[PDB]
């Protein structure tokens, strides 16, 4: 397992990531997960001109599924993201609601999978119109891309290998340093 | 067979507003027809006792006899004798209980410690504790009123009185009330009322609010 | 005649760092050299019991039998049985005791509350109450330490565990260290050592000083009248 | 041809929660009539032994027989020896494992220094450092717990106990732990558990928080005039 920069590109609010539990899921986890409209700095700051417009939104697709698997069984091994209490923040609050629904039963980024789809953050700073075909990946789609074991791997070659490839196609020791 | 009559605890006196008594007993013969009775040195008429407990299978039958007694008469400490007669034992089980005298009355000091910030930081609970210390009679009755409405005994748990470490005669007690941190931040003025004999009016209040205990962070000194 | 079996409590195992298996007898006629013994699952012989209580004036003798055992055997669920062998006793009596099992472990939350400001104004004493809440089972060993040295049990008194209203299995407790305000106005550690099974290392501490808390006290003192226009 | 005894140190005893005694044979090949038995002064070598190691091409096998004994009994210095009888060497070999009583017992004075404000200002990462000083036995074991849950030994690096020149009879050790600035500003409380023999309770904790070191008194005095 090679963790991509999901360690930082995930910009959870302080409340969920911190030790403090949440008062009510209908209002704080509600408003805090959307509180990560700050998950819109790809085209806001970094991908604004670094790459083509499509890839910036493709990176959001990666965060969304990442976000989904934080809520239920990712593979980060960290007290704030996996083996963490934020997943318990969900279970604790729903269980407080007479076990109304498991976090992996509903509210698994399925019942309210839509959120804002981070497009508000995309639009907040980048201010680039999302194509209708581009607007269905930041929201829910049936494929889960297999538990992050082969999606974060999906993202490795999308940039971390192909851009070094095109650099090579563009000293030879530095080329052989890839 | 000897009856273990219990005096009406101050908690019973103040919670029910009436002096209710019972005559629990260690018993040899499980069941007998005749029931409980209460007698006084004055020899006044016995009070009605009802709802006697059913036969105890393990032969340690315990019976309850309820009587109404004037608070002043019990306050004076005059001895009351429980008289229980049974078919097996013709001799009445004459046993007397009176509130102990000769103990100095010491006024409780009630100090309402707010929740530890280590707890409010979790934003999951806020255990307010009513620290009752310094009262000499063992009896005490702590009750919690939130926002002016009394709260059911379920919400709060009152620790049994125990001897104070430093002062031997005096006692202390605890009463923690747990409320979700959402309620605490609203500032609902959770008040603790302690009922004790030594108090001037038998009850004193101490109210803790989210604001209380906050020092003056900002000290603006505008001088022209 | 009748015998009492005393399983080692969490305080006994923790306070002495050893497991004491005492077996006392009540309602037994006094006689010299009363023999008592424990028995394990394999029935291995116990250490020669000592410190047997003398003959009480009430014609009742208490034969206390203590055997030192390794904590691993008792914490593995292995059960012990106390057997009494004496001429006075009509026949041997067997009482088996083991560690209770089936109770869900829960980590205590040691919150330490400083004394109320009202108590300080009285100038007589200060109560530093340590709140051990939300732990199961109902067996905790709360201890107080000042400057790394244990404080005498006379100063601090620990209330017995009691059920917590919010949840059935959970319990809570207390521990109040009465100290003179003079000892508290000057910063002093007053650590609350809480020992419990569920904790990662079986202990937890919470230090309190006059400094702990004390929000930043801004003292903006701005002179602005120097401007005249 | 010698047997090297491995006395599980206090760190191992605390981590594994039990005393697992092992003595390892070095530079010797396996022979018939191999004997292992933890013998004390009393001689009651009735411990179970399991998982006997097999011969190693470099003639280094453990022949390990594990046993469970009290911590305090071992602290008394029972001097367990695994008696080995081998064909090549008829004389049995003894390898005592015990605690030398000569070594003193000074409790560590564990101090938890929060991250320097020069780290937080740069705003990349904060390195909490735990300072353990004043312990005479060189058997400290430091664990870091965040939010009441132990952290993997990978996240922190505990310096080996080194001599303290200023205190001849005491050693010191540090164990830095580095977290992302976005995690330290979150307010998480990191507790430096230090496990040591000399401690009265065998364990001590120190808590470091976002607000452990704060300026308790801001004293600003703005003086705004109109002329020189
Ligand atoms: C608050 O400011 C006034 C201004 O003169 C000063 O006298 C007083 O000592 C200050 N109190 C505190 C607690 O800082
Ligand atoms: C607070 O400020 C006032 C005026 O600036 C000063 O007289 C007082 O001593 C200060 N108190 C402190 C620093 O505690």
From Swiss-Prot, chain C:
N-glycosylated; important for IgM secretion and its localization at the plasma membrane. The interaction with FCMR is glycan-independent. Disulfide bonds join 23-82, 130-192. Glycans are attached at residues 51, 58. Residues 1-102 are annotated as: CH3. Residues 8-98, 108-209 form the Ig-like domain. It comes from the Eukaryota. Residues 103-212 are annotated as: CH4. It is linked to Agammaglobulinemia 1, autosomal recessive: A primary immunodeficiency characterized by profoundly low or absent serum antibodies and low or absent circulating B cells due to an early block of B-cell development. Affected individuals develop severe infections in the first years of life. Constant region of immunoglobulin heavy chains. Immunoglobulins, also known as antibodies, are membrane-bound or secreted glycoproteins produced by B lymphocytes. In the recognition phase of humoral immunity, the membrane-bound immunoglobulins serve as receptors which, upon binding of a specific antigen, trigger the clonal expansion and differentiation of B lymphocytes into immunoglobulins-secreting plasma cells. Secreted immunoglobulins mediate the effector phase of humoral immunity, which results in the elimination of bound antigens. The basic structural unit of both sIgM and mIgM molecules consists of two identical heavy chains and two identical light chains; disulfide-linked. N-terminal variable regions of the heavy and light chains form the antigen binding sites, whereas the C-terminal constant regions of the heavy chains interact with immune receptors to mediate effector functions. This is Immunoglobulin heavy constant mu. It comes from Homo sapiens (Human). The gene is IGHM. The chain holds residues 222 to 433 of 474 of the full protein.
